[PDB]
Design an enzyme around this catalytic site. Structure first.
Site, PDB file in Angstrom:
ATOM      1  N   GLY A   9      28.878  25.649  46.600  1.00 19.73           N
ATOM      2  CA  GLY A   9      29.106  26.597  47.692  1.00 19.73           C
ATOM      3  C   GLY A   9      30.237  27.583  47.449  1.00 19.73           C
ATOM      4  CB  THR A  10      31.278  30.653  49.336  1.00 18.85           C
ATOM      5  OG1 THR A  10      31.409  30.137  50.667  1.00 18.85           O
ATOM      6  CG2 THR A  10      29.906  31.315  49.179  1.00 18.85           C
ATOM      7  CB  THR A  11      36.223  29.863  47.300  1.00 15.45           C
ATOM      8  OG1 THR A  11      35.656  29.924  45.984  1.00 15.45           O
ATOM      9  CG2 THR A  11      37.581  29.171  47.227  1.00 15.45           C
ATOM     10  CD  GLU A  19      33.726  33.698  47.059  1.00 13.99           C
ATOM     11  OE1 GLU A  19      33.794  34.506  46.111  1.00 13.99           O
ATOM     12  OE2 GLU A  19      33.610  32.466  46.887  1.00 13.99           O
ATOM     13  CB  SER A  29      32.759  24.950  50.533  1.00 13.19           C
ATOM     14  OG  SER A  29      33.805  25.873  50.777  1.00 13.19           O
TER      15      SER A  29
END
Ligand SMILES: C#CCCCC(=O)N[C@@H](Cc1ccccc1)C(=O)N[C@@H](CC(C)C)B(O)O
Ligand SMILES: C#CCCCC(=O)N[C@@H](Cc1ccccc1)C(=O)N[C@@H](CC(C)C)B(O)O
Ligand SMILES: [Cl-]
Ligand SMILES: [Cl-]
Lengths: 243, 125, 250, 244, 204, 241, 231, 226, 196
Positions: free
Chosen positions: A29-31, A46, A74
């Site tokens: 996943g995204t940060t 993010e 995330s």
């Protein structure tokens, strides 16, 4: 072998492989990050712009629990929403019985026990999210991070997602260079920088920055989103540091 | 409760549990039905592997469902008792509510309906 | 969630064996040796207190348990399984009998209830059998003294004397030579200590041996006076000192 | 999920057989032989205890012959613990019938009820069947003296003479040879013991390895008496018939 | 309206020297209307005797219930139930219906087959046990029975004397009650013989 | 080979899931120790904070179950907290129903029975933890009772748990062979904690700072955990003799 | 492979295959387009027939006077989810006298789809939805995936060959967003967008399906000779 | 009914009368109102007879199982808590009014319990219809630091006050003494101040006085052999 | 019943009589109506003795379990748990409770919970059948930030009058002092308070 086909099965190591596979979804996943400051906490995430057709500032990721707790995560977004829905039920019943808003450590165990319960049976799947959450209570500021296994600890700074290593390094510098502490407004600026720095791991697509915060002085101990001039000020500070 | 789907479709569009139930019928003793102009006769086979039997008390193959309808069968003997019991109960229930004994077609439609229900219900064969 | 294991985990194999019951009996075989001997005026049950660590206080772990004032139990196999069975056995003695008839159940019927619980773990959904064999000694007015064995299958048999667990095959042979229908209780205790010494490796004394009897009524252990018909429990657990006294005349 | 570990106890084989029922019958074929013989003036029940010990308390022991009511008894072959579950259910059913109709339950009705319970475990519930076969010996005023048997499939049949458990094939041949319709109880007692004596896997048939019972109208005038034989009484009937 | 006095009836029990006695009337009615003169209220399960007064449907129901329970007891225990044990079973069975009780007044009588000791006991409709040494009474003429028993009774009476005492206690109590009478039965119970006598009384 | 996935018997009469739960117990790589004084029961445990981003105050494997009972856990924190929450609930319920504080040994038995159920019932997995309960019982005095995933439990004179339990166990065994008594003959709990830390240092062969340890103390009518500064004072006294 | 038997099983790389297989059912479905301006929001759907004797399967479902969606994948699953939306829109009106926000409608669909992905026995939904609506914050367009993910967009397209329409909208972004107070021109842009996903077949009178909602325009569906104007 | 409880130097004593009534009629002249919950925990009960018996057996049964589970001697506060919670649940419909006393590892204890579930602590207590007659005696003669002999006297005197002055109480005096470090002594019929005088006449009848219609032997034996 | 709780400079003091009645018979003349739900959170009970005991027992259980998880609860939290029981079970209960406690942060606090189940935070509170006779006296004589000795006299005098006029009130005057110093129990006998 076969120990990794079913949840709640101990392998000969003493490991639950299904939980370890859930961690892989989180790492994909995204940060997202969390920073504990002098009198509160700051959350940042993010958001990958997959297309120009995405409406800016509309697909909000950070979620509020009660009025004093922020949650960001995330991994599998729906799993995170499910966890926050439970958190909101837990917080509601606590306040219903005990009157006071749920303390952060108390709230942390409520999520922890629930996530842990999803490692006890084969009839359920573990959560595919690591959740960073916290806020301000009677005893001050608290920041927590919760894993798929149900494991959680308190944190000075926390980070998860694809750019967690880059972020963690940046957070460690802030802890060393500021033993006396960090202000809430500073933490927002730093949070912006860290997300921009952590974006090097997701550098293909451009992204949108989203920040929130709880602070005793700046927000009266309530969760709020960073908007307008204060958001732009943090973006400018972040853009200046990468160049 | 035990909910497991035992009767299910296979890639070629067959329900094997239903088809294997027919194989149990193939194993059972022979039963025959012939209708004349003013009568019906039900013939049944008794396998002579079992002697020293007490024919007075041994369960007979042809069972009265009501005073005007009979039921014979081929297959699992224990399973047949369950259908016979249900049919006998429905026959008395029909008399009670409709004030008329069952037609042979109706009683058949009921027993057939029970058999069908056990082909798409969970936890049962 | 929900317990979605509503099906049997113990099933017949092509050879007609119930695998989980056989495997449970194998777990019993690995367990520490315990025995029971019946006399004319009493019954004795005994076992070794196999301490897991010398720092562990073995007095806190009771292998021989009182079920009713006139019935006791000992086991071989998995200790935790035994512990919960004793809890259930004590309770069923009250719910299914004492609360109905106003008196404690006779040995054979309490055994029957324990056996039932063990049978259900062999057929019910989503459970394994109990990994223990029990020896239940007891007395009641109309049947007198009695001794029963209960297996993981739920089967139970009455014995004049027997042994279960590790060295049961040798111990049963030893008992066949010594047992007769004219034994007094003290003679049975003497034979029990002799039989149990063969299966024990290390220390053999009152602190490493657990032994209890079903014998005469103990008015001193009743806790109250004033009712002639209440004369006290027939179950008594022998002390460390009482065992050592009989080890000198051994 | 849990599906992975399900044995599926209630399914047909490709040949149309019930796996678990067939395997339960295999279990029962290793149990001690039990014989029932019906005569004109009574019924005999004989059964062999499995490899006993000298230290087994026989006079207080019961593993084969059980009393369902004053008129009906059963001989067990298979798992004793499974049998006791069903026996207690049968005892209750008989008392329910007596309470409802104020008459003793007809033998067949009791047999059908237990047999229907066994059937249920083969069609639904996902549980293993009862590994038990019964011989029912009983009397009522409709059919008189009756012998039945039931097995894990839930199927039951009536008999003049029958055996269950071990060596039934050999036992059934011996009964088929010497059985006659005009036979009496004393003769049937002798036949039952002689059959066990020949089919037994033990070296010799003794009193301590047997359970014995008779249902006789040999009770003072028009009524029926159940006699569960004591160890000393089994010893005496063994001497009388000339086996020991 | 009052369930315990729709059908009417009485039961009394007494102890003697190595013996006990239990007796009852034979009337069953619907308030003023007398319906049956063969309605016995004493039943026995082995050597234990139970007399029941009160609402007749519950009398019949309870008899069937205790026959049920004693028959299972015997099958499992391999012995007949004793008076002391049966007394506890009656109390248990009645108290489980604490808030929806059987409208009855049971009386237990018998001799313990082991000790030989004579035993009687009485209950209220919800279980309470009255284990008297001398006598127990129950029914619509219980006050009358108390007065007769308390004056006529003396301890250690022989069987044939005890018969006279209990018979006169019942008869004279019943004759002062509108809902009792229409015949009577007396059971004389010894350790291994029981005699049952039907009494000649006034049929009004 | 599904007899290794759920809690049913293997052909050897073994429960493999239970055995693997015992192995999860050492996943944290922490060692714990418990000893009894005259008036007290002391429990010590290693504390390891590997990440600098962690808030070290929230990192703990010692729990305050009730006012009188303390519990140290050897195993992963999620299962640890699961057991802690349940023990707290059971202790509170006991007091409400029976009108007195739940004894240490009774709570241990109850948790052990719950663990036994997970070894018998298929749908529930065992918890990968070993629970050490400590208190000063009002009847039995200083008390140490320990539970494991098999459902086994027993009282202890002293005990040790973790990867290096055997080294600590033998060290304690040898001390009690000399003194010939079932406890530490010492008046104050401070000196009993000093004994506990000293003998862990000797057994493991490692020195400890104030942040390397975690201490719990049970006295009559209360159980409490020491702060970093309370432990520092303890470490100073050890070094000065 | 070994980890696609049910929805309760992660793969070794942290993937949920049953969810991914459900996502595949959407790609097999017929194309549908969604786009909006500041005043109006438009759905355009290419309906699919079984053969020449058959009718063309309906793609657009009305949820309320101010909200509705178009479907792509298993039609029965769209009926279940659209029924749920109808109820939620209806609960909001009856209890709070409040028209359900399009964003909150998306959150409710997400949470319903999620429960089917974490529990044993059940299955994921096999359909993708494009929700349009006009609420208190103006025009909206949402994209629902049965994984649970819901996304607010200016424009989008799902189904077979949907990438062509999605690129066109990505070019035209600055133009069609400005089409305010002109419904016919916004539909023209949507019809021109869906045309980029066509091969072999063209837009006929019983093939095309259009829906619109806006400032003073209730959610209405156009089929038959009503869409001949736009062919 | 008159039941009392009195604390003393090294323990506690309870006492009770032996009369049971059904309206104005005496059902039992020698009723046993002192119930044993555990060996050293006894309670005296007033109110509905079946209820006091049943609720005492139930809690005594569960106390026994609890004592076995915990490997400890039962406590009075445990019996107290289990009783009050049970009675509260049934909103007073289970008419048991109890005086619970006993000795345990904590010491000697004396409590009262009412049908609605309220409990009270004290050095001297009384319940039942004769509680006012008994409490009058207790309030007049009770003092701190009573001996065992003084407490038994006071307790039995308080019961006598109920026996003589209350119509709901009568017959004999039962006592139970529970001293610390000793077995509890249950003194059934400690006092017997109401023996009936000899009757003036014997009412033994002449054999044959009653008229009989039929005679018959009753078959109590089982079905016979042969 | 005559119960009251009064905040003062150093904390809060609870006061009560000791009479329990069944009609006009005094079933208990030495009752303890000041009950402890936590170390420094106590309550005064009025109404049904069975109901108030059952409630207080449940509250003590809830706060014991709260403390085990979240640390020492506030007085407000304790009042909320009382309220939840009294409000949700108002049809079946007859309980008038005063909750009083001492924090170091909030100092002395008093919450009264009448029949309905409503909560009212106050400087001081009075309740029970005997409270009716001292509304006038207590309103005229109460001051904020009193001393310990002044507050004891205020309660002693107030309950003295309540006892004097109310038949359902009497016996000894029990008091419980809640400060940072700890928990002090006081008792005042008839010969002392009647002559006031
Ligand atoms: C024998 C018998 C049945 C006696 C009926 C029965 O419960 N009597 C009660 C009084 C009462 C209660 C409720 C309804 C009516 C009559 C009674 O005797 N109570 C006395 C003590 C009891 C425990 C022995 B005493 O407390 O007054
Ligand atoms: C039976 C019995 C004994 C319990 C008597 C019993 O609860 N008394 C109550 C009055 C009352 C209330 C509601 C129903 C009836 C009787 C009582 O004394 N309350 C006082 C305080 C309580 C806590 C001690 B006080 O308010 O006067
Ligand atoms: Cl338990
Ligand atoms: Cl009170």
């Amino acid at each position: 072998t076969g120990y990794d086909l079913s949840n709640s099965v101990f392998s000969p190591d003493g490991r639950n492989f299904q939980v370890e596979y859930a961690v892989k979804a989180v790492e994909n996943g995204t940060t997202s990050i969390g920073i504990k400051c002098n009198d509160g906490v700051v959350f940042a995430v993010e958001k990958l712009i997959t297309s120009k057709l995405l409406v800016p500032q509309k697909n909000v990721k950070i979620q509020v629990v009660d009025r004093h707790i922020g949650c960001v995560y995330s991994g599998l977004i729906p799993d995170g929403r499910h966890l926050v829905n439970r958190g909101r039920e837990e917080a509601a019943s606590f306040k219903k019985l005990y009157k006071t808003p749920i303390p952060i450590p108390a709230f942390a165990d409520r999520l922890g026990q629930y996530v842990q319960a999803h490692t006890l049976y084969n009839s359920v799947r573990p959560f595919g999210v690591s959740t960073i959450f916290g806020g301000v209570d009677k005893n001050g500021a608290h920041l927590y991070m919760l894993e798929p296994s149900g494991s959680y600890w308190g944190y000075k700074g926390a980070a998860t997602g694809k750019g967690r290593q880059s972020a963690k390094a940046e957070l460690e510098k802030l802890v060393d260079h500021h033993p006396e502490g960090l202000s809430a407004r500073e933490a927002v600026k730093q949070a912006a920088k860290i997300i921009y720095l952590a974006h090097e791991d997701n550098k293909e697509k451009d992204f949108e920055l989203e920040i929130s915060w709880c602070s005793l002085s700046e927000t009266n101990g309530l969760h709020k989103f960073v908007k307008g001039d204060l958001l732009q000020e943090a973006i400018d500070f972040a853009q200046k540091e990468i160049n | 409760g035990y909910d497991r789907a035992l009767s299910i479709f296979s890639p070629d569009g067959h329900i094997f549990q239903v088809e294997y139930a027919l194989e149990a019928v193939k194993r059972g003793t022979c039963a025959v039905g012939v209708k004349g102009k003013n009568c019906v006769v039900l013939g049944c086979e008794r396998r002579s592997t079992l002697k020293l039997q007490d024919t007075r008390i041994t369960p007979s193959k042809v069972s009265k469902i009501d005073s005007h309808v009979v039921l014979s069968f081929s297959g699992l003997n224990a399973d047949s008792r369950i259908l016979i019991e249900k049919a006998r109960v429905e026959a008395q229930s029909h008399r009670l509510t409709l004030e008329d004994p069952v037609t042979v077609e109706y009683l058949t439609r009921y027993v057939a309906g029970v058999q069908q229900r056990y082909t798409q219900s969970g936890g049962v064969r | 969630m929900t317990d979605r294991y509503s099906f049997s985990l113990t099933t017949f194999s092509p050879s007609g064996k119930l695998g989980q019951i056989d495997y449970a009996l194998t777990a019993v075989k690995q367990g520490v040796t315990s025995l029971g001997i019946k006399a004319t005026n009493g019954v004795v049950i005994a076992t070794e207190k196999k301490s897991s660590s010398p720092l562990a206080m073995s007095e806190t772990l009771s292998k021989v348990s009182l079920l009713t004032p006139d019935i006791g139990a000992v086991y071989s196999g998995m200790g935790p399984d035994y512990r919960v069975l004793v809890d259930k056995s004590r309770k069923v003695a009250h719910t299914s009998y004492k609360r109905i008839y106003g008196e404690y159940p006779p040995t054979k019927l309490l055994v029957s209830e324990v056996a039932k619980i063990m049978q259900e773990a062999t057929q019910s959904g989503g459970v394994r059998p109990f990994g223990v064999s029990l020896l239940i000694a007891g007395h009641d007015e109309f049947n007198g003294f009695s001794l029963y064995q209960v297996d993981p299958s739920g089967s139970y048999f009455p014995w004049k004397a027997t042994a279960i667990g590790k060295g049961s095959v040798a111990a049963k042979t030893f008992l066949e030579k010594r047992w007769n229908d004219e034994l007094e209780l003290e003679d049975a205790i003497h034979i029990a200590l002799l039989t149990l010494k063969e299966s024990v490796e290390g220390e053999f004394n009152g602190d490493t041996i657990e032994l209890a009897i079903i014998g005469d009524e103990n008015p001193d252990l009743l806790g109250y006076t004033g009712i002639p018909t209440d004369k006290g429990p027939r179950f008594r657990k022998l002390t460390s000192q009482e065992i050592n006294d009989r080890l000198e005349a051994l | 999920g849990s599906r992975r570990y399900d044995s599926r106890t209630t399914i047909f084989s490709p040949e149309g057989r019930l796996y678990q029922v067939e395997y339960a019958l295999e279990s029962i074929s290793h149990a001690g032989t039990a014989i029932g013989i019906m005569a004109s003036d009574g019924i005999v029940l004989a059964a062999e205890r499995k490899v006993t010990s000298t230290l087994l308390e026989q006079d207080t022991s019961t593993e084969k012959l059980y009393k369902l009511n004053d008129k009906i008894a059963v001989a067990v072959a298979g798992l004793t613990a499974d049998a006791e579950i069903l026996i207690n259910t049968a005892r209750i059913h008989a008392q329910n019938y007596l309470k409802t109709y104020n008459e003793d339950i007809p033998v067949e009705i009791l047999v059908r009820r237990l047999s229907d319970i066994k059937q249920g475990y083969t069609q639904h519930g996902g549980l293993r069947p009862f590994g038990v076969s019964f011989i029912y010996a009983g009397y009522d005023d409709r059919y008189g003296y009756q012998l039945y048997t039931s097995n894990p499939s839930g199927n039951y049949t009536g008999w003049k003479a029958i055996s269950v458990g071990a060596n039934t094939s050999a036992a059934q041949t011996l009964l088929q040879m010497d059985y006659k319709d005009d036979m009496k109880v004393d003769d049937a007692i002798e036949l039952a013991l002689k059959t066990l004596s020949k089919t037994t896997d033990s070296s010799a048939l003794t009193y301590d390895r047997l359970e014995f019972a008779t249902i006789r109208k040999g009770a003072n005038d028009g009524e029926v008496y159940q006699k569960i034989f004591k160890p000393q009484e089994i010893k005496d009937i063994l001497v009388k018939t000339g086996i020991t | 309206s009052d369930p315990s006095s729709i059908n009417g009836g009485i039961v009394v029990a007494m102890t003697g020297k190595d013996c006990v006695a239990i007796a009852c009337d034979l009337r069953l009615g619907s308030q003023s209307l007398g319906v049956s003169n063969k309605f016995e209220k004493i039943f026995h399960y082995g050597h234990v005797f139970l007399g029941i007064t009160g609402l007749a449907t519950d009398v019949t129901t309870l008899n069937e219930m205790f026959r049920y329970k004693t028959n299972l007891y015997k099958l499992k225990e391999e012995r007949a139930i004793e008076p002391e044990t049966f007394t506890q079973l009656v109390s248990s069975s009645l108290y489980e219906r604490r808030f929806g009780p059987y409208f009855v007044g049971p009386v237990v009588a018998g001799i313990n087959s082991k000790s030989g000791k004579p035993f009687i006991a009485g209950f209220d409709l919800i279980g309470c046990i009255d284990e008297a040494k001398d006598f127990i009474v129950s029914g619509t003429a219980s006050d009358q029975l108390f007065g007769m028993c308390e004056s006529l009774y003396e301890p250690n009476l022989e069987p044939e004397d005890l018969f006279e005492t209990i018979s006169q206690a019942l008869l004279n109590a019943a004759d002062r009650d509108a809902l009792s009478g229409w015949g009577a039965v007396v059971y004389i119970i010894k350790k291994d013989e029981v005699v049952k006598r039907y009494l000649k009384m006034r049929q009004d | 080979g599904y007899d290794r996935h759920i809690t049913i018997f293997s052909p050897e009469g073994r429960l493999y899931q239970v055995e693997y739960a015992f192995k999860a117990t050492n996943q944290t790589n922490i060692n714990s120790l418990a000893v009894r004084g005259k008036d007290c029961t002391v429990v010590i445990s290693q504390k390891k904070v590997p990440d600098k981003l962690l808030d070290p105050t929230t990192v703990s494997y010692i729990f305050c179950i009730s006012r009188t009972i303390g519990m140290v856990v050897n195993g992963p924190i999620p299962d640890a907290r699961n057991a802690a929450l349940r023990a707290k609930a059971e202790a509170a319920e006991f007091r409400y129903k029976y009108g007195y504080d739940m004894p240490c040994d009774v709570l241990a038995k109850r948790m052990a029975n719950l663990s036994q159920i997970y070894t018998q019932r298929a749908y529930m997995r065992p918890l990968g933890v070993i629970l050490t309960f400590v208190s000063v019982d009002e009847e039995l005095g200083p008390s140490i009772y320990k539970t494991d995933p098999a459902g086994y439990y027993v009282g202890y004179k002293a005990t040790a748990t973790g990867p290096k339990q055997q080294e600590i166990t033998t060290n304690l065994e040898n001390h009690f062979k000399k003194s010939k008594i079932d406890h530490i003959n010492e008046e104050s709990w401070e000196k009993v904690v000093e004994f506990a830390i000293t003998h862990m240092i000797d057994a493991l062969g490692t020195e400890f700072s104030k942040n390397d340890l975690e201490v719990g103390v049970a006295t009559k009518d209360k159980f409490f955990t020491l702060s970093a500064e309370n432990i520092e004072e303890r470490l100073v006294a050890i070094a000065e003799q | 492979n070994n980890y696609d038997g049910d929805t309760v099983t992660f793969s070794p790389t942290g993937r949920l295959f049953q969810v991914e297989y459900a996502l595949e059912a959407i790609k097999q479905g017929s194309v549908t387009v969604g786009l909006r301006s500041n005043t109006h929001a438009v759905l355009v759907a290419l309906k699919r027939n079984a053969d020449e004797l058959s009718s063309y399967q309906k793609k657009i479902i009305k949820c309320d006077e101010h909200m509705g969606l178009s479907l792509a994948g298993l039609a029965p699953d769209a009926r279940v989810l659209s029924n749920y939306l109808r109820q939620q829109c209806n609960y909001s009106s009856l209890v709070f006298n409040r028209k359900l926000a399009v964003e909150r409608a998306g959150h409710l669909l997400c949470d319903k789809a999620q429960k089917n992905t974490q529990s044993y026995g059940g299955r994921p939904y096999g359909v993708g939805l494009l929700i349009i609506g006009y609420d208190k914050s103006g025009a909206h367009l949402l994209e629902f995936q049965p994984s649970g993910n819901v996304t607010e967009l200016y424009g989008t397209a799902i189904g077979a060959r949907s990438q062509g329409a999605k690129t066109y909208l990505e070019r035209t972004l600055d133009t069609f967003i400005k089409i305010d107070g002109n419904p016919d021109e916004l539909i023209k842009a949507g019809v021109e967008a869906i045309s980029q996903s066509l091969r072999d077949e063209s837009l006929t009178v019983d093939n095309l399906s259009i829906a619109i909602v806006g400032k003073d325009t209730p959610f209405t569906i156009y089929d038959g000779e009503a869409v001949a104007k736009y062919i | 009914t008159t039941i009392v409880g009195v604390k003393f130097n090294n323990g506690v004593v309870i006492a009770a009368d032996t009369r049971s009534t059904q309206g104005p009629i005496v059902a039992d002249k020698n009723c046993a109102k002192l119930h044993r919950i555990s060996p050293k925990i006894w309670c005296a009960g007033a109110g509905t007879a079946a209820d006091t018996e049943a609720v005492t057996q139930l809690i005594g049964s569960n106390i026994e199982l609890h004592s076995l589970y915990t490997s400890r001697e039962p406590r009075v506060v445990s019996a107290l808590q289990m009783l009050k919670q049970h009675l509260f649940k049934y909103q007073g419909h289970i008419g048991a009014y109890l005086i619970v006393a006993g000795v345990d590892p904590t010491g000697s204890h004396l409590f009262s319990i009412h049908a609605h579930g309220s409990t009270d602590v004290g050095y001297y207590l009384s319940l039942g219809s004769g509680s006012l007659a008994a409490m009058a005696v207790l309030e007049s003669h009770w003092k701190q630091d009573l001996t065992k002999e003084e407490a038994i006297k006071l307790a039995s005197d308080a019961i006598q006050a109920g026996i003589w002055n209350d119509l709901g109480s009568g017959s004999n005096v039962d006592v139970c003494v529970m001293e610390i470090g000793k077995d509890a002594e249950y003194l059934r019929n400690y006092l017997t101040p109401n023996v009936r005088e000899e009757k003036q006449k014997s009412y033994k009848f002449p054999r044959g006085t009653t008229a009989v219609l039929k005679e018959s032997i009753v078959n109590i034996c089982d079905i016979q052999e042969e | 019943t005559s119960i009251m709780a009064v905040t003062f400079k150093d904390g809060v003091i609870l006061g009560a009589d000791s009479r329990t009645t069944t009609g006009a018979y005094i079933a208990n003349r030495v009752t303890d109506k000041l009950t402890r739900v936590h170390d420094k959170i106590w309550c005064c009970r009025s109404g049904s003795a069975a109901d108030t005991q059952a409630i207080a027992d449940i509250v003590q259980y809830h706060l014991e379990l709260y403390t085990s998880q979240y640390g020492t609860p506030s007085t407000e939290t304790a009042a909320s748990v009382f309220k939840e029981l009294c409000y949700e079970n108002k049809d079946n209960l007859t309980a008038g409770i005063i909750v009083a406690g001492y924090d170091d942060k909030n100092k002395g606090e008093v919450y009264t919970i009448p029949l309905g189940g409503s909560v009212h935070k106050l400087p001081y509170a009075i309740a029970g059948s005997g409270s009716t006779f001292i509304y006038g006296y207590c309103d005229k004589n109460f001051r904020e930030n009193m001393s310990k000795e002044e507050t004891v006299d205020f309660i002693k005098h107030s309950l003295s009058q309540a006892i004097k006029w109310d038949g359902s009130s009497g016996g000894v005057i029990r008091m419980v002092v809640l400060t940072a110093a700890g928990v002090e129990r006081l008792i005042f006998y008839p010969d002392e308070y009647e002559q006031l």
